[PDB]
Amino acid sequence: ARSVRHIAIPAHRGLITDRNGEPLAVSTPVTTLWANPKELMTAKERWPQLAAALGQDTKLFADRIEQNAEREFIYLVRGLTPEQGEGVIALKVPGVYSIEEFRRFYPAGEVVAHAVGFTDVDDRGREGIELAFDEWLAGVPGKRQVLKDRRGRVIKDVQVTKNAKPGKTLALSIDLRLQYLAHRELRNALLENGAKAGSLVIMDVKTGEILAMTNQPTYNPNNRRNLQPAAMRNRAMIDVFEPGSTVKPFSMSAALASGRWKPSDIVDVYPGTLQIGRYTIRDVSRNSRQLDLTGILIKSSNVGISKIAFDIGAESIYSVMQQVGLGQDTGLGFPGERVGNLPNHRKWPKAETATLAYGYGLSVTAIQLAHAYAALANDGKSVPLSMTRVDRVPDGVQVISPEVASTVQGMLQQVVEAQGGVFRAQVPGYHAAGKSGTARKNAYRSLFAGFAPATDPRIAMVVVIDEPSKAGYFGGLVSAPVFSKVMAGALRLMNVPPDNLP
Numbered sequence: 228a229r230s231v232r233h234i235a236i237p238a239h240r241g242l243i244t245d246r247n248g249e250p251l252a253v254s255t256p257v258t259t260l261w262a263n264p265k266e267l268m269t270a271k272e273r274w275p276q277l278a279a280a281l282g283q284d285t286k287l288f289a290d291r292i293e294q295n296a297e298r299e300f301i302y303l304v305r306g307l308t309p310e311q312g313e314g315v316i317a318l319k320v321p322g323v324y325s326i327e328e329f330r331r332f333y334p335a336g337e338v339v340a341h342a343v344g345f346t347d348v349d350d351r352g353r354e355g356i357e358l359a360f361d362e363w364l365a366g367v368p369g370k371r372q373v374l375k376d377r378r379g380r381v382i383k384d385v386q387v388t389k390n391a392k393p394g395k396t397l398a399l400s401i402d403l404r405l406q407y408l409a410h411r412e413l414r415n416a417l418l419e420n421g422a423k424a425g426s427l428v429i430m431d432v433k434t435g436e437i438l439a440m441t442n443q444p445t446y447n448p449n450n451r452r453n454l455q456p457a458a459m460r461n462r463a464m465i466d467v468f469e470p471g472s473t474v475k476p477f478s479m480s481a482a483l484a485s486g487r488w489k490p491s492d493i494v495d496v497y498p499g500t501l502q503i504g505r506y507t508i509r510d511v512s513r514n515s516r517q518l519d520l521t522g523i524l525i526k527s528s529n530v531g532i533s534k535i536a537f538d539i540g541a542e543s544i545y546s547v548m549q550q551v552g553l554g555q556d557t558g559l560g561f562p563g564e565r566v567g568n569l570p571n572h573r574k575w576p577k578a579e580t581a582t583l584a585y586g587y588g589l590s591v592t593a594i595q596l597a598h599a600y601a602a603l604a605n606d607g608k609s610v611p612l613s614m615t616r617v618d619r620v621p622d623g624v625q626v627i628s629p630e631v632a633s634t635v636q637g638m639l640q641q642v643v644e645a646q647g648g649v650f651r652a653q654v655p656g657y658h659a660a661g662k663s664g665t666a667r668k669n670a671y672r673s674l675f676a677g678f679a680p681a682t683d684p685r686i687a688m689v690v691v692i693d694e695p696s697k698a699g700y701f702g703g704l705v706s707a708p709v710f711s712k713v714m715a716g717a718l719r720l721m722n723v724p725p726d727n728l729p
């Protein structure tokens with residue numbers, strides 16, 4: 228006859244900003260319309276105007292009400308503007324009710340779609356930060372007591388038994404200015420090279436903060452009608468790859484820490500191949516005999532790094548890679564984040580020793596690679612990763628000795644600045660450091676990973692471009708130019724003083 232029931236009071240989802248307070252996700256007030264069929268059934272002459280207001284066929288609308296004439300609740304539509312919300316309310320139909328709800332808008336849209344993420348139809352987080360910090364952002368909902376009659380007509384609002392608590396504001400580590408630069412330059416590299424996909428990550432080597440994370444393809448998270456799923460992949464965090472030659476500096480770190488190698492030591496790489504039973508190690512350029520350790524990185528000799536790997540043992544290389552976080556949990560607690568794999572064999576045969584040392588037989592993400600380079604640039608100290616603005620920097624872990632990291636930094640500066648090096652990664656006005664890669668998946672992954680300024684490193688960056696088709700595929704020519712252009716702008720946006728001085 229008269230029954231007490233409780234209706235959920237939706238809560239306003241917390242504002243997401245970039246590190247500078249620019250809005251990235253905002254809760255917009257929407258109006259949801261529900262109906263009591265049992266009441267609607269007493270006012271059928273109003274139905275047609277309501278169907279039209281909801282853009283529905285009059286017969287399909289009517290059929291649906293009749294089919295649910297037993298129920299006391301149905302959604303009519305979720306998530307109208309309050310202006311179109313009022314339109315339907317004006318129609319004054321018995322048994323139509325309104326709930327005030329919230330809809331996310333993403334001001335920056337596709338520029339930061341993967342990082343910021345997406346909410347489902349219930350305003351819960353579903354991809355990216357929205358998912359990872361859903362508990363922070365969501366906000367516990369409210370409860371109001373209503374009286375209903377036996378037909379389920381809402382007679383009376385009685386009281387609020389639990390206040391809605393709004394979700395909490397969250398400032399990302401992302402800098403929208405760098406995020407826009409990275410986005411623009413990665414899109415243009417994708418189109419210039421007719422490539423299938425790519426990622427670019429920018430990290431603060433001192434604070435562990437991710438300043439930019441971008442992927443192609445991307446999508447407009449404000450356009451909830453397409454949802455092409457391949458464009459929704461946050462590739463920087465969920466696509467694993469063999470990193471190939473971008474891990475040679477970690478091989479070189481193991482070599483320098485072994486006590487068996489100094490930078491001026493020499494390896495004979497002639498004739499640019501080496502038989503390992505069934506396997507044959509090949510250098511792309513084979514006009515070399517004696518190379519020093521720096522030369523082995525400038526020419527990316529697989530023969531040279533392999534011979535060093537045989538001398539020092541796979542264990543020492545595995546150890547460095549594990550300590551800098553290759554194939555390791557990032558601690559970011561993004562659900563569905565990929566960890567890849569760094570297989571720890573007890574002893575390694577020669578084949579597996581060589582392939583590890585030049586970046587096959589492990590799987591990593593662009594974010595792990597960027598983090599690893601961050602530790603190398605930060606004098607061998609790994610600072611924990613963050614996707615949220617860091618006020619108080621947590622203690623880092625010394626994973627490579629400062630002398631060794633300093634020495635390898637210098638070698639990577641030579642990889643960029645030396646005769647026959649990756650000149651396309653040069654950053655006019657600054658000393659930049661890094662290493663190119665070109666990985667087989669004929670299908671190629673183009674890689675460049677590095678940091679700047681070499682004098683006092685601030686920024687680590689990774690560029691991954693999947694299946695370039697138009698103009699070659701070497702990391703040194705496809706990805707290096709992107710690193711150059713994004714590092715040119717990012718350093719200046721952060722007011723990092725040019726270090727290419729007397």
Ligand SMILES: *C(=O)[C@](NC(=O)[C@H](C(=O)O)c1ccsc1)(OC)[C@@H]1N[C@@H](C(=O)O)C(C)(C)S1
Nearest residue numbers: 471472511527585663664665666667701702703
């Ligand atoms: C590292 O990435 C690199 N890559 C290769 O040797 C490739 C392979 O595995 O066959 C490759 C050779 C020709 S095209 C792809 O060594 C494991 C070397 N580093 C690359 C780079 O710096 O971009 C080279 C110079 C292409 S070879």
